[model samples]
Target: GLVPRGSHMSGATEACLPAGQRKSGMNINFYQYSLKDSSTYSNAAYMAYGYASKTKLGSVGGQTDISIDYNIPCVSSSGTFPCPQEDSYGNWGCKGMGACSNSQGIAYWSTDLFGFYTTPTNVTLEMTGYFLPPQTGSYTFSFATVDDSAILSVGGSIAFECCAQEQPPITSTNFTINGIKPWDGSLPDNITGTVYMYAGYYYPLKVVYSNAVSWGTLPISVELPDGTTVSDNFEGYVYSFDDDLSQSNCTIPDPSIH
Candidate 1:
């Protein structure tokens, strides 16, 4: 069945990287929903994005493994299950879910039955790591997805979000910002609103993804201020968790414990 568009479907790119240097991709962690053995399930997106938003796992860099307590029941609203607090670290406590190290940033899974599941199921994803801009200019970061949804953040701020729904192919947007001027009318003073970076600095990056109900694909691209847009190639690690988030299973520190 086709799912209706969400109130928070994919939106315009508020933050993107400008051109100067180019890269191909970034690190990504994919977690298929597991833990419970019942036939019913909740929106996996809520678990991924919602949890990543509230805990240390979402903000930190590098590879992280997640263990979940599917035993925790779901909450209902209006006779439907929105599955809120599925990602609450406090609820997970120190007893459930764990993190571990992983390699690579890109992943493609064709079936729903992943991690600990015996059949097809819902899933969640997160991407973390850093990128070094080629030059000091504005950049536009954009992404595309199918079935699943994603949120992109750079330098500690959310730049774009395509959450809870599939999005169309990436497109370019032109905007302006006020910049330092050399003299009166010496040069045009407007610059793009994307992140400005030096040649050798690495910016902190994080992305959250959710696999709602079917096949999934996530691809991210960066548009340099110079109009040179290339697919982002990332340098980092990856990990996946199934049924119970615990310190024994994860390398990233647990917020519930600390």
Candidate 2:
């Protein structure tokens, strides 16, 4: 009943690499409720979209295919890379954008927030799609959000809105992202997870970036077996099964469990 992981494939690690560079990005649906509390934002969209979206893992309905700009150097620990002027380093994300650059989609070149947000006090971002691994090897994924809380899972059938954030953090013993504990007194908390993947499979992937405070930010990064980062190199490498809650006609592996 479980979905097939890239490692649990039919023994082949090569299937996709269609011609050209016209590829769709991962389907990231942002659900905004009128609620005021950030704590309940996750359950709000969870049950609200629960019946609306038809599928499990997580249900979300709103704008889809929001261009994701991952691994922005905003919020660096050292002074090597500086956060934005509006945002202080270690704050996790910039303050959307200030008078210095009062333009929408300000996160376009920064965090994975992709500039999809504009002062949204109550919003839950859920990104669902198949991550086509370029190579069959081990990969490490990590996430850091501004309002400061997020979870990511690859190739696993787990509840997204119900019960996952168990005590003691799950990062220690699992292929899922962030079972690990967050740091004390920080603006953006970080967690890491690793998994072995085969290139041919379209591993089922779901990421819930739930903001705890007011501001929302998405800064998730991944490193290949070679240790090179994927956020900065995610152009032709990333491919979404759907254009917008839709599917591609090409023969990509199944995006979900059987």
Candidate 3:
């Protein structure tokens, strides 16, 4: 049911590539919420998003407020190799019976959060508005104001937000945008007008301190629907973990191990 309006409810890995580009870019916005506790700041055990949107542009800055439902998941580490499942690189995830991970599983990304037994600890954020770039100029757009992390990118452009800070330091996993390319008289017609959006997040607990935090990319096919290739765009943001709440599975890394 969480599929984009008028679109089929498909898995996150489903390829989406239209055929050509439209002169005007397509825009999509989404609201995300992460659990928090003020004191520790860099600790969030559960995360979720309220809904997604498709519009020409995001808020014009502080003039709008969006509320997101906290669709948490009931995850536990009550079995062998308990606590959190470790990735091949020792990254942490929901503790399950070594089955497919709910946190990393494509099924989780495909289904609505409500299908699970967990519920969110609601939080709200305000958009800081942005100036649309020129028809042909490099740009880095971003949106952030919270105790957790969130990000969005469209049409060869990206916007991001995140938070993580603690003693021994859980590095801030903020997102960043490099640059973008715009269309002029250089491209064809059917392949000339098009846009796309991609988004995802990273937190403090699961990732080790020394490693770099990474942004999740939308499927390439998802953005280039009509098979029209375009330049890439990206932006980054970092949040302060001052409102985190969950603490069932907290474990600070041993400095000596670092």
Candidate 4:
């Protein structure tokens, strides 16, 4: 069993996934589920990030993490997984690591029980999801949304709100105001969002405090200030970048010096 140590190096691999495979309570159909799966889609999950000190246990995109559990058939030939020596955990992570770890943490089954990658040998699964839990404290700001009986409290004040049945087989759900660039202000001193989801017949919801500028995929158009639009210039922006807040104060030492 190898422990995935070291900090995240590449923006694409570091924050989005574990240096190794991670474990989870249940296996989710990432492909079918939008935020639920990373393999079939591009997201800001992996990227440079930062956090402001606060008071809250967790959030969907921050502290709380999501992962899928199943044995990809291809890796079984090496005798490195799903064997009696691997333990009785079945389709879970390597012996030592918990349900979650950094990118590189290996989540595998002791045997070739479930199935393998979608037939292609070189398939790279985004494999896991984790949300940085929220903390009680002041914050510059960002906007987020989740469907369910969700209670979002920011700056000691309840901001945008929503409450509904947590429907499952979650379709394309949209949360307005997804990205905030150079987002710095001040969210009172405390912020929190509680999501109570209905399991089985309802969708599973989560709380996420994202400082990641690339919070999710979005459309960006290249339009010159002259109001000229390029014919081939329209596309989506994948999630990737730094969200560290300590450097938020960066500015010229002297404005008048100019």
Candidate 5:
């Protein structure tokens, strides 16, 4: 009797398959069964096969290294982004004027992940870094922010974006790729698209977020192929600047006579 190399017959092959299904565990079709002869058909085997096959399709392992800047420019709130002219009150610019940072070290509001005290309002945060996948596989990224908007870009492409109109602080809708972006003010949700990453390869990542009110938090996370979820790891300094001040020397001077 010809049998598979590791055949472990458990009852009949019919038991391994579901009603009206031609494939058994691990998606092994009847033809494969006939070619491979008898083989183990257990839940564990199916899981392992699925995992192995998935891993084979993508990258290996790595961590997400990121550096977040507190305040940049709040262009979304005013229905403009990328480039927006400043108003008469100096409300818009590349830096200064309209700026926001993480909710950290504030008079009120509990500090959240990535370190923050009170959420920032009417400001934008720019995060840049690289992610190293453990295995070259499909990945899903997600984000959740309150009272404003956020955009995530990976490998120089837009991965996720969620923007609210009329400054609706309440979260009811979600944007997703492979996953959904939670609308909650403090909860993090996965994006909709699937991203393929290579093991040990450094993929460029960037996120731009703006909050209109100071009462919410910003949380972003990612789901990997290995059934593992990871959070953003902030590195370097929180870069902040103003139009008059360049990133190289963006320091606020003492109060000068107007």
Candidate 6:
């Protein structure tokens, strides 16, 4: 985990992935799904992230803050995010959705699980995009004791299934024991997920990490060859299809429409 902390580092584009292959027309679309209703930490539960438009996210290109928890209540329409727009609803964000409702996400970071307001808990943030691995090797995805749990799927497959499903876990599942815990004995049990693939194709990548009760961050990291590691930005190896939000005062209420 020696890689830089955020994605806004130097020479990210010049690292692994090249320019020609980046013609895939995607940008690693990120999204945050919070309960329509507020909940307490003690009552937080492992919920699923619905494929909703409100959750889909996008950045103007050079920024790294896909998800942020201001560490304070989203009270005013100032700062990085405009406060909730006083619509026909109570401090319900831009369109009665709360904080960053208009922007299609939250104004803060990890702490504010519930995208809009800082008070609501039980949030599931995800990175749904096309991950183009630059080097062909065993990429191991891991997560730090996610408040509830974390799931990483490369090529559209989950490492482990929670309920009665059809496909078995680890089908084309690449990488094992991500940040969930490495070989170390701390954090949430030391287990990882592993998968193998080439470097020229675009694999559908989806990472789901949720915060149920307490306000915190889900540290996600990936172990690459040369025995090196990567965090948040995954360096420049991650890509998605939504980065058209070019204005600071604008919001894509539903990211799926376009």
**lDDT, residue 71, model 3:** 27
Query: What clash count does candidate 4 reach?
Result: 56
Off by over 4 Å in 4: 1-40, 43-135, 138-161, 168-258
Q: How does candidate 5 score on lDDT?
A: 0.31
Candidate 5 structure quality by residue, lDDT tens digits, 9-119:
321101000112111111000001111111221122221121122112111112133322233233443442222222212332344334323222222222221343333
C-alpha TM-scores of all predictions: 0.38, 0.51, 0.19, 0.19, 0.35, 0.45
Instruction: Give the range of the ten consecutive residues with the poorest summed lDDT in model 2.
Output: 161-170
Best by lDDT: 2
Candidate 3 residue lDDT tens string, 192-251: 112222222121211110000111211111123333323322122111232222432222
Candidate 2, position 204, lDDT:
47
Ranking by lDDT: 2, 6, 1, 5, 3, 4
What is candidate 6's TM-score against the reference?
Answer: 0.45
Show where candidate 1 strays beyond 4 Å.
Answer: 1-27, 32-49, 52-121, 157-193, 232-258
Q: Which stretch of 10 consecutive residues in model 3 shows the poorest summed lDDT?
A: 205-214
lDDT of 4 at 197: 14
Each prediction's whole-model lDDT (CA) = 0.34, 0.43, 0.22, 0.21, 0.31, 0.39
RMSD of each: 21.4, 11.0, 22.4, 22.2, 25.1, 15.5
The true-versus-predicted C-alpha distance at residue 129 of model 5, in Å, is 1.3
- Residues 65-87 of candidate 4: C-alpha lDDT, one tens digit per residue: 22112322223323343212233
lDDT of 6 by residue, 1-258 (tens): 554343233211111111222323222223454543223212212222232234444322222233333232344355343332223244344443345323223333432432333322344444444555677666776664444345565553332221111121233323333332222342454346665545644455555554433234455667776568776555466554422223232221111121
Superior by lDDT: candidate 1 or candidate 5:
1
Residue range 140-253, candidate 1, lDDT tens digits: 765532223344555422311212011211221111121211223323311223555444444545555444332333445567767886653433212112212222322211
